[model samples]
Target: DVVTLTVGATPSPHAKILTYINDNLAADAGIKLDIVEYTDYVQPNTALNDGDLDANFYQTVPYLENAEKQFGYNFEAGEGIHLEPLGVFSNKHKSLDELPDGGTIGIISDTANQSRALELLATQGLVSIPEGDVNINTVTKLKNFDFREVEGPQLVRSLDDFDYAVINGNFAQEGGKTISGDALVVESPVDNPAVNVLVWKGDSKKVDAIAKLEKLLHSDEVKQYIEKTWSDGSVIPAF
Candidate 1:
């Protein structure tokens, strides 16, 4: 008997990847995938909590734990399937060095992602964040740069408003920016906590099927598909 698993994810890479699996891999695995797409980060979780989704393919462990604590969501996430590197993209500048001293920088406003954004900037020596639960105020500006917070989905669109913007990988790809080609700087993927995973709400009857999805998502063919389809490093296999 083929089991059907309903999964939720964002448009470009998440849902797209799942679609590829459903078409290419799910049949042989004896599973049917019902992929649902969401543009915002929060709704997928809300839907998962409500049992609208059997699992979700967006977000990282850090963001998941924080949300669980904040909203009392009971979830179990599987091993990461892919890493969408946080990238710094600019419409007017080609490289990070081209940014002026007082240039404006836009980052995601979600509190759970604040530190990740700051840490990426810190990697470039653009800002220094203080220890202990970071927010925008705790970060010290190294070059008098102005920092602005835009919602995650709009970061790419905000590129025209700010001199530069730090965007999550999926949005950057959706906006037609590549990590290797368009981004001025891309966050390191090695052991990065921001790797996206398949998440399900608490314990469910679909556990067996979800296990298959987790395994398929980490399979060799899926890895090669990711590598070839997103050769520019837009979406990377986390395993």
Candidate 2:
């Protein structure tokens, strides 16, 4: 009985990490990997559901769970591999407190993303999201700022136009916008589900193979690799 493990990732450190496993570890266990890189976020999971991929390590628990609700796929997450905090980046203010009245804060213009976006901002007293409900319509009030929705991928590119924009942690490097040097506030997985995970259908046929990768993902060797490879402090390495 030959078990072939084909994994899909949405690119970035996800793809890199999978490549690392294939190159460094999988062969030792006689495990072969068919690595698939998806250019769009949906492809990995969509392909996985269609039985094209054994599993995927791309999105956070919150992200994957939300996707599961929408797409109705039987998705489940393994141990977290890394944190990609939704960062608050700015070009005009050093801190959220520095924002003047009538301020405009930028966020992803998609229903699926606003829940966590508001949650991150609520901690900073930037905006309010009701407890348990993630609807944007439930926003109570804005003290001096208003939320402006923009294209998800363009959130970083359109940063200069607005006083600040919340971008995916990687967008900092991908857009040459340094979240570390410039971000006034950031959130992590301490109390959040923002860390990426190895996810698959609840009744995956490759559960054993996926479990192997999940254990490998949290191994100290892989942890050290993420620490060494990114070094940018963006990939917050810990399960």
Candidate 3:
């Protein structure tokens, strides 16, 4: 019997790459993959918990943990898939050194992305937060600079209000920004634990299918396709 795999993802380059791999590389694996696109983050998990989706590929482990706690569902994350480096972009500042000492910064208000964005800023030495507290919604204090939180989509429009903005790759692309040259700083993929994954119900016995999918994802064919499709380094194979 052909194994049915339902995947949920947002309409972004990363998701597109995953779809590409399953459709092309995994075709001979005796699996019929169904790719589902969700506009928001919450719906995928909800659909998964209700058994509407066999699996999802849109979120990272941290996001899944937070969602499990909030929604009271036991979602299990699979192996590491790929990383979409969160980046800091600005049309106004040339470099982090050029940013004015007390300049305002913009970040997404969403919890998962906000934390990633702030961590990238902290890594660049532009801001400092309290120790042992890395939650985005909980980060109300910054030692050296002032920051304003805005809706994820409004970041590019309010570019003039801040010196730099920690933006998601998708939003950055939509705003005519490229991660390779336009971002002043980006999260490094080396050992990044937040690489997105295939997630499913904790009790599902789909180990064989999962192994097949993993193998196809890590194949050279998929890697070459990824490199060819996204020359900007936005899609990476996490083997």
Candidate 4:
């Protein structure tokens, strides 16, 4: 009998790449893979907790940790996959160095994403916060600059309001922007704990099917496809 692996994915190049790898790399291994596309981050974890999916790969570790705490469920990372580096995009400034002192910056306002954006900014020397502080609730922590925070959906719309806006990969892509070459700074995948992963219920034991799926995801063929298809270094192989 073929083992069915249901993955929750969003309609992005990352999801399509995983689907292609699964279909092509594991076909002869007697594994059947199915992807359930999600329009938002909320549904995938909800479905997984409800036993509607065997596994999912649409989010990073921080997001998974956030969801687990919010929903009171246990989720486990399956295999290290890859990272989609968060980038800062702007219409008014060509580079971060070009921005004036105390220039305003835009960031996503959602609880989870706001922290990620702040961490990125801090890493780029744009801001600073107390050490070991994980939660970034507002722009006031930005000691070097004046900034404003807005909801995630409104970020792209308000690009003109700030010198540079921290934009997630999907949103930036939708706005016809490329992070790899266009952005002044981007998060690095190497050693980043937020690399996306194949996640499953905490109680589930590793099985041959899951191992096979993991192998396909980290295979050389899939890595090549990721580099070639995206062409902008947006998605990188973690393995």
lDDT of 2 by residue, 1-239 (tens): 54679888756678888888889988665567888876446678888889888888777777787787777888888877888767888878888887768878888755556777777888887666765666456776567666788776678777778888887765565666544676678775586667788888888877877788888888887888888877655678865
For candidate 2, report its TM-score: 0.86
Judged by lDDT, which candidate is best? 1
Query: Which pairs of residues collide in model 3?
Result: none
Rank by TM-score (best first): 1, 2, 4, 3
Per-candidate count of clashing residue pairs (backbone under 3 Å): 0, 0, 0, 0
- Give the true-structure RMSD of model 4: 3.0
Name the better of 2 and 4 by TM-score: 2
Q: After superposition, how far is residue 149 of candidate 3 from its true place, in Å?
A: 2.3
lDDT of 1: 0.88
Which regions of candidate 4 fall more than 4 Å away from where they truly are? 97-104, 135-154, 160-162, 203-208
Q: TM-scores for all candidates?
A: 0.95, 0.86, 0.82, 0.82
Tell me the tens digit of each residue's lDDT in model 3 across 1-239: 87878877776755676678766766688887778877556688889889888877778777777777767888777677666788878878878777676777788876767777877877766556677646554555444566788887788776877888887766676677777878788789887877777788877777688667767766678777767876786656676
Assess candidate 3 and give its lDDT: 0.74
Q: Which stretches of model 1 miss by more than 4 angstroms?
A: none
lDDT of 4 by residue, 1-239 (tens): 78878878766655787678776876787788888887566778888888898878778778777877767878877666777788888889877877777778887755567788888887877667665434444334544566677665567777878888887775665566777666778987667777777778876553678778877887888878877777786767677
Least accurate 10 contiguous residues by lDDT in model 4? 133-142
